[PDB]
């Protein structure tokens, strides 16, 4: 059972979300679509699809860690206000 | 003498500080006079601290300054039920 989950460094067991399993499943079915296509200009658009969408997968995880950073900032400051 | 005063009244049950706003006609013009009656001796009836202000206009002749000097002498040496009957006089 060697299916992978790719997480950034610094997380714990109780912080594991749902998007860290779909992203290794995004690249496993990506190579199975490329092998049935012999056109070089069609595989370059999927290579354009491999760069820019994975950049948005990095962008949606960097925004999601900043949602958890200001939520823990709101939990830390409420001990300092009280 | 509740028909001579305008506005609501604010009364404490100890009556150590009173506040009421009345109107008079000394020469045909309505003068809103706001008088605050603060008491310094708790064992007495007569006032000690009399501060009488005007809510309306105050840019006039020497009639209202003579009137405000008349109210401060007739609140210290006259009780409050006898000076209201003198206001109808």
């Amino acid at each position: 059972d060697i299916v992978h989950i790719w997480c950034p460094e610094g997380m714990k067991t109780s912080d594991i979300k749902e998007l860290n399993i779909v992203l290794p499943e995004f690249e496993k079915t990506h190579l199975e679509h490329q092998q049935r296509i012999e056109s070089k200009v069609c595989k370059a658009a999927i290579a354009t699809f491999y760069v820019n969408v994975k950049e948005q997968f990095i962008k949606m995880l960097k925004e999601s860690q900043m949602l958890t950073n200001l939520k823990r900032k709101n939990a830390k400051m409420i001990s300092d206000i009280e | 003498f509740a028909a001579l005063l305008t506005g609501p009244l604010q009364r404490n049950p100890l009556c150590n500080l009173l506040s009421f706003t009345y109107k008079l006609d000394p020469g045909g013009q309505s003068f809103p006079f706001c008088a605050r009656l603060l008491y310094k001796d708790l064992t007495a009836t007569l006032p000690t601290d009399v501060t009488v202000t005007c809510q309306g206009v105050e840019v006039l002749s020497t009639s209202w300054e003579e009137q405000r000097a008349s109210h401060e002498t007739l609140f210290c040496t006259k009780p409050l039920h006898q000076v209201f009957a003198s206001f109808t006089r």
């Binding site: 299916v3 997480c7 594991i16 069609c42 658009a45 699809f49 900032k73 709101n74 | -």
Partner: protein, 102 residues
């Protein structure tokens, strides 16, 4: 990015993927189809046909993949949900300014 290698006891309380995650992934797929077709010159028909076959496959694999049932934020309103804790963190800075200066 580190490794996976799941347990055999974790596969009992798993749930399918939620609707609001899949509605944002359908929205950004339609935004990136219009991104490529504004950037392409020729052969616009069959490259669209390989992307409609790919988005049929990628939404099929999300229905078969089981996710943990832990709560997440909505990805559809991710520009507007990001700003509303910034109006509250600034409210605790002026709330500290009503406290620390007094």
């Amino acid at each position: 990015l580190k490794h996976g290698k799941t347990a055999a006891s974790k596969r009992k309380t798993w749930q399918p993927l939620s609707k609001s995650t899949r509605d944002h992934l359908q929205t950004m797929m339609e935004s990136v189809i219009m991104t490529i077709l504004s950037n392409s010159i020729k052969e616009k028909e069959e490259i669209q046909y390989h992307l409609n076959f790919l988005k049929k496959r990628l939404l099929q694999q999300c229905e078969t993949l089981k996710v943990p049932p832990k709560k997440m934020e909505d990805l559809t309103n991710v520009s507007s949900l990001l700003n509303m804790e910034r109006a509250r963190d600034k409210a605790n800075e002026e709330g500290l300014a009503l406290l620390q200066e007094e």
